[model samples]
Target: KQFHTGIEIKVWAIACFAPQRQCTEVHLKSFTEQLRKISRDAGMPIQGQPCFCKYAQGADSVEPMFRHLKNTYAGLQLVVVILPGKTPVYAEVKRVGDTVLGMATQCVQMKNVQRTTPQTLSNLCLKINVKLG
Candidate 1:
């Protein structure tokens, strides 16, 4: 709850949709590391502890994670940094609990990023940090 200003961004997190069928571990790991590093320097920093990310194998995994996030963090203004091809997770967040939950969601897709390239990934992270804030 550091950024307790205007909408109160309670939690900042990252989630990957592509599983083994669509993505690889090296890509996800590299992207997450770059994102965390650049974002930390950018002001919208994601803390180091507990790894603020989880895996979403398919569309089915989206709802459960969303539910878990809602329950875990009260009145959350969640900023979800999405990987390039994760449209389903973004859609579910948009569809569910737009009223009842009162949880705001901001999403940024790394569609232009080269997932494993450090410089490009860092650039994407800066964009994501700005979008989330």
Candidate 2:
């Protein structure tokens, strides 16, 4: 089931944030690749290359990081934040992205990122597509 005729939402700019010790470069790379594949399959292709992908030290950094990303990338559509299990960063990410910034954001656990499955990717794609719309 593909969305053939609906609005073609393009991901103009994508960014990712994660804790320094939780996610490695390799994991981020593979996760982005997987995300691209699933998004395309879901009929929402990523248009621009990722503008920002870096490690944040703590929960306090999440809001500022998102603000910086929003300011730097004018067309930023979605932000993927990887959490290190139970943390306050998740709440902060939601507050900034959903409330203050009104930007689309998706949060993924580090464990899921390290060992991704198609189902998980599909779920994420669904969330992103809806948010973009």
Candidate 3:
């Protein structure tokens, strides 16, 4: 516990949609802001520049983003994503986060939080443990 005591919680924030993908801009902004607010409220900081938001450009590029995150941030423990809805990217993120990159995740279902409270952050953090507990 001492050795890992100073370790900070780092999550690679990535949105699974093309930057210009129809409604991605709005979701991207909302996602970024929400994370910051949640981070402030929960006392569990979110670290690092999120996986490049420019990713929605191509299909294969997204994986590279996650790969970069995993390699660059050795301290990374989770990959939290905010997307409009289910799509190929969601499965891709799940694949990379679980099978490929082996990063645990706390993917926020877009619909679940279209209109939610800051208090929900507590439960979201718990979801991570419940997922891997």
Candidate 4:
């Protein structure tokens, strides 16, 4: 199935957040780092820029960040977000891109991470948008 064997693949986009109350500078940075490494290893890298790998407050934060991600990353295939508890960020993300934009898009969500180790994070990556068989 070498339809385009050597063609460059677009790196999958990411939009990560935790509730403003829960997300500290250190935690957010480490979370983003984990996401970058895990997704990269899984061949579904997140954007390296701080703007792309965002941190925000409340459900209100989702639309703006996702909009930015979509506008900025050409050939964006999917957005993977880590949500904090029961919030509308997940719904808003889909509504904006999946419904409003009407692009052939996909999204993956982690409502919570029971564990946050390198090993666990990588495992999370495997279960999400990565296309590994």
Q: Candidate 1 at 115: error in angstroms?
A: 1.5
**Once superposed on the true structure, which residue ranges of model 2 sit more than 4 Å away at CA?**
1-18
> Could you tell me the lDDT of residue 69 within candidate 2?
81
Q: Give all candidates' CA lDDT scores.
A: 0.53, 0.71, 0.58, 0.55
Model 1 residue runs over 4 Å out of place are 1-11, 49-52, 73-88, 97-100, 104-132
Q: How much is 4 displaced in model 3, in angstroms?
A: 15
Candidate 1 local lDDT, 17-106, one digit each (tens): 645445455555665566566556655555433225665765567667777777776545454545446466666666653544555455
- lDDT: the better of candidates 2 and 3: 2
lDDT of 3: 0.58
Clash pairs (backbone) in predicted model 1 = none
What is the TM-score of each predicted model, taking all chains together? 0.57, 0.83, 0.59, 0.56
Candidate order (lDDT) = 2, 3, 4, 1
The global Cα lDDT (0 to 1) of model 4 is 0.55
**Per-residue lDDT of candidate 3, residues 16-55 (tens digit):** 5533444455655665567566655455555535644443
Candidate 1 lDDT score at position 117: 60
Clashes of each: 0, 0, 1, 0
lDDT of 2 at 73: 77
Q: For residues 3-28, could you state the per-residue lDDT of candidate 4 as single tens digits?
A: 11222224455455665456554555
